Ligand binder design. Structure first.
Ligand SMILES: [Mn+2]
Ligand SMILES: [Mn+2]
Length: 493
């Protein structure tokens, strides 16, 4: 499905042949709640500013093309080294011990399809969402044709087309031109990968509180306590990192190793063989009538992105320390055990041993030399160690209460839910909306109270003062401070 080469702004692309075009969705679902006082505003804006961005050139196709260029750059690492190889042995030993040596069964078709959520686009080959083809309990003709072919091919062990549908992620971003792309996965790759990786990932999700892979953790529960106790079980210094341009710069050799590691304890069938071969191949994406090939990166819509990304992080964080130990003449090993750490995509929190604190400059540089761009989680200061009462993970800070440990979403994330609302219609600019009397907004604004309560009565009151004004716009309840506080407590215990 590549025809004749395109050359526009510096991307290597081709005219889409053999498939229908997949035009990206313009505009944004987000719109402004009317009458919001200025003290509640935080400065965030939709990623697709539209005609609210003065530069006329900043059109969707240009923006997407600009952000795709990055993925066509040659990767930092061409091959994995000895420290990443050491770290891979750790992950392998963690999984082999988790699974008790037993291989995880493939799901059959029905079970795998059932794991896909109804509201997901079907990828570049089938229009609409999953649910637009599975109405009266059964699949329609188009989806079934496509899914039977993919399933047949995959069970013969041959790889599938690792193709996605391109677009701009519709989300709120600060006032600063990098912007996240949408990698809408082909439904056939999705079902096949779900058949192969769901059982091992279900097992990982149960054991998420212990980590290192945090995918599945519940930041509102006792999970938080086991996360924190574990961090302080071996150290009294910590590191909180986030990474810029993570997805877009990931090296194939690392991604490929992550996939091999995750499939190691899977049932060794032809379907697994096919899924491994598919996800390991350089992913392509269809912008409109153009198909674009990549040279680096991990598509954030790859089936099981979070876990696979989390293995990459484990590999790279553990190698960076191991490399830094080697330079000082030390052999370091078993990092995840000796210095417990957690990982959720590009987000991580690590225990720092005295030796590791001393090796901090060399570790950040070793992270740089693997192609990553580390930054402090506390998005204000430089990278340094941060104490117990300062740790940050998954946009949440922590506080030791009588009901164990308690997590607080950063105040801005709460506040922006008062300023913005994810409407069901596309807006071509920043503007206000009155279509706010929806059940989904209601459950969001009641939940927002439980979120705010964690910051104290004064913040709760500040938020509720605006929430009480929005009760004319949305059918919902405003709890008392005590009532909300009882909900946090109930969610733990
Ligand atoms: Mn980041
Ligand atoms: Mn992050």
């Amino acid at each position: 499905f590549c025809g004749e080469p395109i050359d526009y702004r510096g991307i290597t692309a081709h005219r889409l042949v053999g498939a229908e075009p997949r035009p990206p969705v313009s505009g944004t679902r987000y719109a402004k709640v009317p009458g919001v006082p200025d003290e509640y505003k935080t400065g965030y804006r939709p990623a697709n500013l539209g005609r609210s961005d003065p530069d006329s050139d900043k059109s969707l196709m240009n923006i997407a093309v600009k952000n795709l260029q990055v993925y066509q750059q040659e990767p930092k690492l061409d091959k994995v080294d000895e420290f990443i190889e050491r770290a891979a042995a750790d992950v392998l030993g963690y999984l082999r011990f988790l699974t008790k040596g037993e291989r995880q069964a493939n799901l059959n078709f029905k079970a795998a399809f059932n794991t896909l959520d109804l509201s997901t686009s079907c990828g570049p080959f089938v229009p609409g969402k999953k649910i637009d083809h599975v109405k009266d309990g059964v699949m329609d003709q188009v989806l079934a044709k496509h899914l039977y072919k993919c399933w047949s091919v995959a069970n013969s062990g041959k790889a599938l087309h690792h193709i996605y549908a391109c677009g701009l992620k519709d989300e709120l971003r600060p006032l600063d031109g990098k912007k996240r792309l949408l990698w809408g996965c082909d439904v056939g790759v999705a079902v096949c990968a779900a058949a192969v990786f769901h059982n091992i990932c279900y097992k990982l999700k149960m054991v998420a509180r212990f980590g290192p892979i945090a995918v599945g953790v519940d930041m509102t529960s006792r999970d938080v306590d086991v996360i924190i106790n574990n961090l302080t079980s071996k150290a009294s210094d910590f590191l909180c990192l986030d990474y810029s341009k993570w997805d877009s710069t990931m090296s194939p050799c690392v991604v490929r190793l992550a996939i091999d590691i995750l499939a190691d304890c899977c049932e060794q069938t032809e379907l697994t063989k096919s899924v491994v071969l598919t996800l390991k191949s350089h992913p392509m994406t269809i912008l409109d009538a153009m198909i674009v090939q990549t040279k680096r990166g991990l598509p954030s819509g790859m089936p099981f992105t979070s876990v696979i990304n989390s293995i990459c992080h484990w590999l790279l964080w553990s190698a960076a320390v191991y490399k830094s130990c080697a330079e000082i003449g030390l052999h370091c090993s078993n990092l995840y055990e000796d210095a417990p750490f957690y990982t959720y995509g590009d987000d991580g929190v690590y225990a720092m041993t005295p030796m590791m604190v001393s090796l901090l400059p060399a570790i950040i540089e070793n992270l740089r030399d693997y192609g990553l761009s580390p930054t402090a989680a506390d998005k204000t200061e430089f990278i340094d160690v941060c104490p117990l009462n300062k740790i940050s993970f998954l946009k949440r800070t922590f506080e030791l209460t009588d009901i164990g440990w308690v997590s607080k979403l950063d105040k801005s994330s709460i506040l922006r839910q008062l300023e913005w609302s994810k409407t069901t219609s596309r807006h071509m600019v920043i503007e206000e909306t009155y279509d706010l009397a929806k059940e989904e907004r209601g459950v969001q604004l009641e939940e927002l109270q439980v979120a705010a309560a964690a910051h104290g009565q004064e913040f709760f009151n500040f938020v509720c003062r605006e929430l009480e004004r929005q009760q004319a716009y949305t059918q919902f309840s405003v709890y008392s401070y005590d009532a909300a506080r009882k909900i946090l407590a109930d969610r733990k215990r």
